Amino acid sequence: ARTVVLITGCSSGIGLHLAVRLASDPSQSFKVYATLRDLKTQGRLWEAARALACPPGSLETLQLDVRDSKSVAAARERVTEGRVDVLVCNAGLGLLGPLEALGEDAVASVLDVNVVGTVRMLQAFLPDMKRRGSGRVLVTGSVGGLMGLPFNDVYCASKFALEGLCESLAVLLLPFGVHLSLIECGPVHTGSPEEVLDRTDIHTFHRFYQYLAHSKQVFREAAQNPEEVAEVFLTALRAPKPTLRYFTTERFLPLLRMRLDDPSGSNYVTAMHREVF
Amino acid sequence: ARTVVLITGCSSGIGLHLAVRLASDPSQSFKVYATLRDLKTQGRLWEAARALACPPGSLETLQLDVRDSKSVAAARERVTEGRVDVLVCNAGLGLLGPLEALGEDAVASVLDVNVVGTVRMLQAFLPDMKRRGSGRVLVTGSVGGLMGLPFNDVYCASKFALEGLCESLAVLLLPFGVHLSLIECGPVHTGSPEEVLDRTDIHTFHRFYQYLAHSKQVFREAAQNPEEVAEVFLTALRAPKPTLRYFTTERFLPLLRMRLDDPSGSNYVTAMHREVF
Numbered sequence: 001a002r003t004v005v006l007i008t009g010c011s012s013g014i015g016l017h018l019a020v021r022l023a024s025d026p027s028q029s030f031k032v033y034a035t036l037r038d039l040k041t042q043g044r045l046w047e048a049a050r051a052l053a054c055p056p057g058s059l060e061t062l063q064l065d066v067r068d069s070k071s072v073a074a075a076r077e078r079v080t081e082g083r084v085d086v087l088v089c090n091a092g093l094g095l096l097g098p099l100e101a102l103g104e105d106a107v108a109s110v111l112d113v114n115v116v117g118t119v120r121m122l123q124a125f126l127p128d129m130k131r132r133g134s135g136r137v138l139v140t141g142s143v144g145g146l147m148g149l150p151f152n153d154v155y156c157a158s159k160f161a162l163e164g165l166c167e168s169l170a171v172l173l174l175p176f177g178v179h180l181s182l183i184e185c186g187p188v189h190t191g192s193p194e195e196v197l198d199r200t201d202i203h204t205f206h207r208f209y210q211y212l213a214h215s216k217q218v219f220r221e222a223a224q225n226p227e228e229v230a231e232v233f234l235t236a237l238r239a240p241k242p243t244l245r246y247f248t249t250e251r252f253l254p255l256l257r258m259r260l261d262d263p264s265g266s267n268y269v270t271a272m273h274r275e276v277f
Numbered sequence: 278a279r280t281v282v283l284i285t286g287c288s289s290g291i292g293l294h295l296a297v298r299l300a301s302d303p304s305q306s307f308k309v310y311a312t313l314r315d316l317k318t319q320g321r322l323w324e325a326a327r328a329l330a331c332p333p334g335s336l337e338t339l340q341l342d343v344r345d346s347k348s349v350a351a352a353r354e355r356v357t358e359g360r361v362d363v364l365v366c367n368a369g370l371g372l373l374g375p376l377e378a379l380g381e382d383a384v385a386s387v388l389d390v391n392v393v394g395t396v397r398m399l400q401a402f403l404p405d406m407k408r409r410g411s412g413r414v415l416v417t418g419s420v421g422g423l424m425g426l427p428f429n430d431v432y433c434a435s436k437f438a439l440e441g442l443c444e445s446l447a448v449l450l451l452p453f454g455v456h457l458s459l460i461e462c463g464p465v466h467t468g469s470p471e472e473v474l475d476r477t478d479i480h481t482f483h484r485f486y487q488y489l490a491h492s493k494q495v496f497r498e499a500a501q502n503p504e505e506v507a508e509v510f511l512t513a514l515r516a517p518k519p520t521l522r523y524f525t526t527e528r529f530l531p532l533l534r535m536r537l538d539d540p541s542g543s544n545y546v547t548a549m550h551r552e553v554f
């Protein structure tokens with residue numbers, strides 16, 4: 001009857017706002033499983049759910065740790081309807097800093113949550129979709145998945161990885177009737193200094209500050225409401241033939257095109273260096 | 278005096294051929310540390326070294342496991358010259374199959390060797406390069422880093438990740454005088470069926486066969502000599518101002534451009550589906 005949606009990473013941000021947008025939809029078309037790594041963070045989702053007056057039974061929370069394939073399987077068994085019509089792979093971690101200041105565990109964690117975590121969800125959920133010959137997968141992407149950003153080396157690695165993962169899968173899934181799309185987000189309004197200085201050189205440290213200053217100004221001028229981003233997920237959801245990629249904004253497309261039409265990377269690296277520094 | 282080169286993944290392929298090309302250079306400009314995960318595989322490198330008559334002391338082998346930051350640090354201490362002029366990040370794993378048939382450990386291993394392994398090398402070696410204000414980093418890339426290939430979902434994820442990692446770093450390293458370049462390789466002439474069938478559906482299994490058939494024909498028609506690929510690394514090495522990206526072939530550039538100029542991904546996914554299936 002209803003469209004069953006399971007969303008990862010609902011404790012804040014896009015995931016939180018998408019979950020309550022869908023559950024509160026005036027048409028009541030959606031049953032939403034909002035999943036979270038730590039149940040102690042669920043308060044914010046329930047406060048938003050109340051604000052939007054989600055009908056009882058339109059929204060349920062599950063604990064799901066995308067690092068643990070047992071946790072993934074336990075949450076899938078909790079989908080009482082026995083299918084997922086829309087899977088939204090949104091859990092993700094950022095990681096910001098000079099590459100040599102990043103702990104090895106932090107690097108592996110970002111990769112595990114952002115890439116392997118999405119692999120675990122797709123392994124768990126794609127089979128029943130392929131069998132039914134139907135289902136929609138939406139994956140939260142980033143501008144940092146489409147072009148490299150300084151001091152985001154590992155975050156960008158992880159978001160570029162989701163691009164390759166999803167594009168590869170889409171080439172195969174086409175004749176199966178299962179549609180996968182990336183939702184490419186720019187900024188969204190959702191170590192300490194001594195720590196970082198201890199792990200890098202003064203010149204890199206200064207470039208980091210410059211990057212942070214520029215980033216803050218891009219964010220204050222350009223950040224989108226998660227309400228507006230969530231509606232782009234909805235657009236993808238309802239598209240009779242969805243495309244592989246949706247963009248939540250036109251903002252970064254000129255930078256992207258400059259990347260796109262000089263494959264040597266020389267124009268992009270130059271332009272981004274000037275843009276930031 | 279000599280240009281000190283440390284290359285990862287020298288047991289076969291590009292890494293093996295690049296190592297002996299450099300060590301055997303008639304000019305004797307290069308001292309090469311060819312590194313390998315398992316020393317039992319070093320025979321092939323030494324057979325090639327003899328064939329090309331590398332002078333004694335032009336080539337040394339080190340054991341290096343890019344999964345282990347202690348192994349990385351132990352090999353760096355073995356660079357008797359106390360600097361690395363050229364770091365070649367080439368170790369890599371493939372992974373081929375229906376996504377749901379891939380073991381979780383195999384997925385994590387590919388990511389660890391191909392992405393985190395390269396992060397470990399850059400963390401270990403970039404600091405002294407930035408300090409000197411000089412050094413060249415060359416990273417073995419792939420066509421699968423630039424466009425998604427069906428049944429290579431995790432391999433492509435890993436090779437897309439190297440793109441984001443390197444591009445992000447290049448934006449920063451520009452004013453430091455340290456130059457990083459990807460060398461984008463097409464095919465290079467360097468589970469059992471019951472296993473895979475047990476882990477997927479018959480229809481995906483059949484698409485896998487089709488992909489393998491097409492792949493084999495692309496390889497037989499298009500595979501390059503690693504001798505020819507190694508010379509593209511040399512070109513990058515010697516370029517007074519290197520670009521971010523070198524391509525070893527023009528072959529896949531029409532497919533890439535079609536990807537590049539439809540950001541929605543719709544033309545690429547369609548064209549690649551038709552190309553393979």
Ligand SMILES: C[C@]12CCC(=O)C[C@@H]1CC[C@@H]1[C@@H]2CC[C@]2(C)[C@@H](O)CC[C@@H]12
Nearest residue numbers: 143149186187188214215218219252275
């Ligand atoms: C990381 C930031 C800033 C913080 C964030 O939420 C993600 C966002 C993605 C767009 C980036 C931006 C930093 C400034 C950049 C790099 C602009 O120059 C162009 C794209 C911007």
Ligand SMILES: C[C@]12CCC(=O)C[C@@H]1CC[C@@H]1[C@@H]2CC[C@]2(C)[C@@H](O)CC[C@@H]12
Nearest residue numbers: 420426463464465491492495496529552
């Ligand atoms: C994985 C393969 C085949 C095996 C290999 O060594 C890597 C190589 C990269 C180019 C791929 C190719 C498979 C066939 C493809 C997908 C062609 O259609 C275009 C690019 C090709």
